[PDB]
């Protein structure tokens, strides 16, 4: 019971995970859809793959929260409310199915980056506060997604 | 079904929206590392935001070049996903009750900029690199690497279970 409450590191690590609860289960929500506009054949198995990647990531989140004491829960993430919105509203905007797989495979890395930030950041926080025991879920997550942004990287449309 | 339904109709086109996305995006920059420098108490942090505040109006300069070479103006599309990781940086700081937890968040919230600003540029100089544009690849690249240099910076700032 507090306006502000988040008073301390422990406060911030725990709302981040909440952010990134919830942010994983968008992209969930999200992927299909891509997964359904893209033309290009390795773009949708790679999307497919990463699909069921990110079911994986939210169970060990679930296992992050069962480490520090708590059930699993979610809080808002306008960061990727908006990239998922971005991505809806580009894609209407695309003639061109190579174009839209351009834009698709453009869209995917930006979502990558944002978990990138999220992962890498939620780690720093860890280790500082003594929580190496939830860092080796949070880096399993990590490296997926840099796997994931790497292999968009390389993609040939 | 929106206003420019089906509109993108070529690469140089998306290249085109990219572009204006992006430079959306360094605008809105403009106008929040003023807040985050202002809430920032840690001095490398402020100051060293301010240093990325300059960076930005010449991240700005460089991609008017860029329009100019295209011959197209740089107003014409927003950036979602830059309105959202603002609002999200300005959310969270409304959350917070001390000056060192709200530090940390800051540094967290630019670097999830610095990342978006990475992708999108990453993305952009390789489709002016298909498309031929030599000069615009050059002025994105440098770009990139003022992000690149921002996010390290972030990232080593020295500002600080039972
Ligand atoms: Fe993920
Ligand atoms: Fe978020
Ligand atoms: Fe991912
Ligand atoms: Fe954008
Ligand atoms: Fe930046
Ligand atoms: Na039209
Ligand atoms: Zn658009
Ligand atoms: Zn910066
Ligand atoms: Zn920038
Ligand atoms: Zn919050
Ligand atoms: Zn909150
Ligand atoms: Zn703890």
Not at 65 to 76: A, D, E, H, R, T
Not at 102 to 124: D, F, S
Request: charged share 25%; proline share 2%; with cysteine.
């Amino acid at each position: 019971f507090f306006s502000r409450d988040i008073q301390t590191m422990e406060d911030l690590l725990l709302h981040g995970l909440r952010d990134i609860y919830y942010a994983e289960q968008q992209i969930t929500k999200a992927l299909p859809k891509m997964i359904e506009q893209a033309t290009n054949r390795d773009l949708s198995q790679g999307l497919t793959s990463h699909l069921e990647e990110t079911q994986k990531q939210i169970e060990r989140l679930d296992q992050v929260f069962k480490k520090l004491g708590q059930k699993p829960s979610g809080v808002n993430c306008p960061a990727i409310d908006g990239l998922i919105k971005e991505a809806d509203e580009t894609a209407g905007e695309i003639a061109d199915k190579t174009v839209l797989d351009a834009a698709i495979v453009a869209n995917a890395q930006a979502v990558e980056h944002y978990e990138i930030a999220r992962y890498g950041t939620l780690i720093a926080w860890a280790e500082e506060l003594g929580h190496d025991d939830i860092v080796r879920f949070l880096t399993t997550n990590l490296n997926e997604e840099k796997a994931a942004n790497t292999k968009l990287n390389t993609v040939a449309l």
